[PDB]
Amino acid sequence: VNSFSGYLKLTDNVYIKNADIVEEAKKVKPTVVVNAANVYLKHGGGVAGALNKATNNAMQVESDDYIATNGPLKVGGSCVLSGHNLAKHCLHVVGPNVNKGEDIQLLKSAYENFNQHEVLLAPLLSAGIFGADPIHSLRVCVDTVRTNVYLAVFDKNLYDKLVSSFL
């Protein structure tokens, strides 16, 4: 039993809710919240900008030190950093950005990072400003992630479409 509430169950291990991931993280305090990161960990907008704003920019300060030490992430890659006031940990995962011409096949690699964590609160990777089709992202998620993932979908209209079209 865990503390996630109001989710629709899609599969054995994937759950979905119309929710603001920031508000969900603050209420749940999950062990892991996933950020929709870019390779530079520049958290300017979308999910990343919202999450970073909720940390009062502490996420960005920590991220800048990470990049100065380690250099950029790979598209499809990830790193574990602090969850600040939102979660114990933040798993920063880089899905391909269609608006930069990155290969959508890397979306599966991105979701594979979730399998290193038993339970996660996450957005749909490569959705929103990353330009991928969220219906496709959900399909890849269900077909790749084996651990327990709680998906927060900000847009109610999109949430209803994801549920109604789910095979």
Q: Which residues bind ligand RA3 (CB under 6 A)?
A: 20-22, 46-47, 50, 123-124, 127-128, 134, 152-155, 158
Task: Give min distance, CB of 29 to ligand RA3, in A.
Answer: 17
Report the alpha-carbon distance of residue 129 to residue 70 in Å, rounded.
Answer: 26
Phi, then psi, of 122 in degrees rounded to 5: -145, 155
Task: Give min distance, CB of 130 to ligand RA3, in A.
Answer: 7
Q: Alpha helix locations (H) across the chain?
A: 21-28, 46-54, 58-70, 106-112, 134-144, 156-164
Task: Give min distance, CB of 80 to ligand RA3, in A.
Answer: 20
Closer residue to ligand RA3 (CB): 56 or 70: 56
Q: Using alpha carbons, list the distances in angstroms from residue 135 to 63, 114, 127, 131.
A: 30, 18, 9, 12
Task: Give min distance, CB of 86 to ligand RA3, in A.
Answer: 12
Closer residue to ligand RA3 (CB): 110 or 127: 127
Closer residue to ligand RA3 (CB): 69 or 119: 119
Closer residue to ligand RA3 (CB): 27 or 65: 27
Residue with the shortest CB distance to ligand RA3: 127
Tokens 């960990």 sit on residue: 41
Report the alpha-carbon distance of residue 120 to residue 81 in Å, rounded.
Answer: 14
Task: Give min distance, CB of 3 to ligand RA3, in A.
Answer: 18
Phi, then psi, of 3 in degrees rounded to 5: -90, 0
Closer residue to ligand RA3 (CB): 65 or 160: 160
Tokens 């996933």 sit on residue: 34
